[PDB]
């Protein structure tokens, strides 16, 4: 309400009055009586008293204000009783579709003459085509996984860095403890991106996976060394080391299954939601087919006059909804004990 | 003190015939069994957004009587691990809890703490654990419970911590619930839950076709506001990037 | 003519070579034939005649509307309409200019928008207002004399 001399005490001037907890609600017989104390002066605290005697017939819809003091207007708040249907709310189903078209990817080939096969079988005893099949079969296999990293690079940038939460390996200038235990704080930027994604997408059935460089993902388990007798014959050429590439983690926030791979660049982790509900779909890889053309049929593009092998890989990867976050790990080069 | 429960808004779904013949044939989906479960979930979120507008309104009536800020950023000469600085939030809760039991003289109150699950994660500060990351066994949040519904037992109170993502991140909210039935702080009154399958009721937009109407009548009231707000500052996860 | 769906108006002006956000339920008697924003257009919409700038009727010997003989633009999937249309330009001296029209329309918003890749004057659509929502129908009534 606003009298002829009132201060807002929110935008303090000659304005309204907040009726904090002394509102005038509708009593019996649909009347409104309230003895209220409005402020008048901010530096004076005059607190002029007044009263608002009011009645309104509800079905007759007319109000009736009187007041002993001096009124200018009253800001009211009520609704229309929705007994007689005049305004209800409707709900309807809408349905659209999204296409998962798969297409012909690039086929790789290996031009193979005849007088180069006997030249390798004679001198070096090199099989010319079993060193070219596995050359092709490793090129197509790494073409897939380099595309996956390209897929998660571009289809994170279309989220406009909604979950870009950074991290420093250099502790703060007033930390003053061991920087080995500062790497435990990586787990609270991981669990902070995780809970930030279950709040803007409302899903609770995740299997949040982390892909990252084995330099960067090494800070997550933060494991310590063990020592034994250095016998020179019983050395183990990386016999038990698997926790820098494939490790399971179970926080209090959500569960995890991290992935360490040297193909991604050092300096950034990447969180990906995977839900167990078959209805919801975050990211999906669709491998269509993969077949080898053994020599006959297809020609060559660089030099068509000689026979050649042929191999192609048909696949695509799609993003239905992009729940993907990036943790920028900063100053991780092992130079913390040099500054 | 009066309590009035008024008629609320009707939720109703228009259902023609050809919309049911097409969706059953083209996609095998029902417009009478999916619009109904949609009508229920829309009505079930009015009663959980009214409460958030209620406690935001009721805290504004007290003019910030119990307003105790917490800083996730540690102080400029704290100089230890910033994980255990978040054990300070356990005693900003208990400092404003005992501030309630001192003014309102309560000695039998169970407290409840509602807040964002990003913000209430700081209460247990549970550390990680590790195992083998095999694809054959993926536990899709099998044991995850303590970020939405947590129990507590301090030396100053018991708590029944509630985490839901509908409330905005940045602040906590502590409500006093006394088991003594004479004293009452915040009571929720569900009056009725009425649903009709047409039943003579028409539609507002297109009256010529049948519709399934439903509504629920309810209100929630505050006799005396015992509510506090812990302003958690700088919880954007940038405590390590600074 | 007695029992049937409510036919929309035919003549659409697509001057300037294109039209955008054209209301398709214009000309109808609002209230008992159609209710705008309540009932939709049916998915039987198709164009039976068109008229470019330099066209030929080939029913009369004048530059008029061109009949689309078995190359009408039906409502295709996702409510869009494309068509590679060849039309006669003159009479005996058939120059036969070609022009593609491709377009979309929303059933819910009764809103068409047409764009040709050349020059176009107007078009003659043919569609029915949908009877999914009970807007208007036919009523049988018994009568008796002696």
């Amino acid at each position: 309400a606003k009298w002829s001399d009132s201060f807002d005490e929110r935008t303090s001037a000659a304005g309204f009055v907040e009726l904090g907890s002394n509102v005038v609600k509708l009593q019996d017989n649909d009347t409104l009586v309230g003895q209220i104390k409005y402020p008048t002066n901010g530096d004076g605290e005059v607190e002029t008293d007044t009263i608002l005697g009011k009645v309104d017939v509800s079905s007759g819809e007319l109000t009736l204000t009187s007041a002993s003091g001096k009124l200018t207007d009253v800001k009211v708040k009520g609704y229309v009783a929705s007994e007689q249907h005049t305004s209800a709310t409707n709900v309807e189903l809408g349905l659209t579709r999204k296409d998962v078209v798969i297409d012909t990817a690039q086929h790789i080939e290996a031009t193979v003459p005849l007088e180069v096969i006997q030249d390798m079988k004679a001198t070096y005893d090199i099989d010319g085509v079993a060193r070219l099949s596995e050359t092709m079969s490793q090129l197509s296999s790494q073409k897939v996984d380099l595309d996956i990293i390209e897929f998660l690079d571009h289809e994170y940038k279309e989220t406009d860095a909604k979950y870009h939460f950074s991290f420093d390996v250099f502790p703060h200038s007033d930390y003053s403890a061991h920087p080995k235990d500062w790497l435990e704080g990586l787990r609270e930027v991981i669990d902070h991106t995780t809970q930030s994604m279950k709040n803007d997408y409302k899903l609770y059935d995740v299997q949040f996976v982390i892909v990252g460089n084995p330099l960067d993902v090494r800070l997550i388990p933060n494991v310590s060394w063990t020592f034994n007798g250095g016998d020179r014959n019983a050395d183990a050429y990386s016999n038990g080391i698997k926790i820098n590439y494939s490790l399971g983690a179970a926080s209090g926030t959500a569960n995890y299954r991290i992935i360490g791979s040297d193909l991604v660049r050092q300096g950034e982790l990447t969180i990906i939601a995977i839900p167990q509900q078959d209805n919801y779909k975050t990211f999906m890889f669709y491998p269509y087919t993969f077949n080898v053309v053994n020599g006959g049929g297809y020609l060559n593009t660089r030099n068509p006059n000689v026979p050649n092998m042929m191999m192609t890989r048909r696949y695509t990867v799609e993003s239905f909804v992009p729940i993907i976050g990036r943790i920028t790990i900063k100053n991780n080069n092992g130079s913390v004990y040099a500054r | 003190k009066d309590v009035v429960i008024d008629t609320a808004q009707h939720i109703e779904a228009t259902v023609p015939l050809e919309v049911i013949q097409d969706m059953k044939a083209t996609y095998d989906i029902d417009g009478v069994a999916r619009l109904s479960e949609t009508m229920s979930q829309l009505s079930s979120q009015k009663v959980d957004l009214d409460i958030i507008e209620f406690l935001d309104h009721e805290y504004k009536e007290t003019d910030a009587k119990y307003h105790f800020s917490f800083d996730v950023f540690p102080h400029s000469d704290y100089s230890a691990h910033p994980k255990d600085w978040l054990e300070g939030l356990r005693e900003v809760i208990d400092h404003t809890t005992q501030s309630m039991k001192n003014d309102y003289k309560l000695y039998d109150v169970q407290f409840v703490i509602v807040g964002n699950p990003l913000d209430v994660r700081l209460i247990p500060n549970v550390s990680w654990t590790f195992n083998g990351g095999d694809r054959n066994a993926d536990a899709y949040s099998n044991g995850i419970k303590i970020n939405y519904s947590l129990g507590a037992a301090s030396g100053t109170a018991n708590y029944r911590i509630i985490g839901s993502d509908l409330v905005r991140q940045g602040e906590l909210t502590i409500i006093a619930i006394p088991q003594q039935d004479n004293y009452k702080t915040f009571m929720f009154y569900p009056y009725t839950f009425n649903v009709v399958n047409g039943g003579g009721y028409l539609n507002t937009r297109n009256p010529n076709v049948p519709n399934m109407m439903m509504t629920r009548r309810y209100t929630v009231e505050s006799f005396v506001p015992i509510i506090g707000r812990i302003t958690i500052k700088n919880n954007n996860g940038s405590v390590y990037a600074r | 003519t007695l029992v049937g769906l409510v036919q929309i108006k035919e003549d659409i002006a697509v001057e300037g070579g294109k039209v955008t956000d054209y209301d398709l339920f214009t000309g109808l008697k609002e209230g008992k034939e159609v209710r705008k924003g309540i009932d939709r257009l049916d998915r039987k919409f198709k164009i039976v005649e068109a008229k470019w700038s330099d066209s030929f009727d080939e029913r009369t010997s004048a530059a008029g509307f061109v009949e689309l003989g078995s190359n009408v633009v039906k409502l295709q999937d996702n409510d869009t309409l494309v068509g590679q249309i060849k039309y006669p330009t003159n009479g005996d001296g058939e120059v036969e200019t070609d022009t593609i029209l491709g377009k979309v329309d929303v059933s819910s918003g009764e809103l068409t928008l047409t764009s040709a890749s050349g020059k176009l004057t107007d078009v003659k659509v043919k569609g029915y207002v949908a009877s999914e929502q009970h807007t208007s129908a036919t009523n049988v009534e018994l009568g008796l004399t002696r």
Partner: peptide
């Protein structure tokens, strides 16, 4: 319905020319 996207399914015979 209007805002529901129509899916034209595929009937079985392939209608070869003569």
């Amino acid at each position: 319905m209007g805002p529901i996207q129509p899916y034209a399914s595929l009937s079985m015979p392939i209608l070869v020319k003569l």
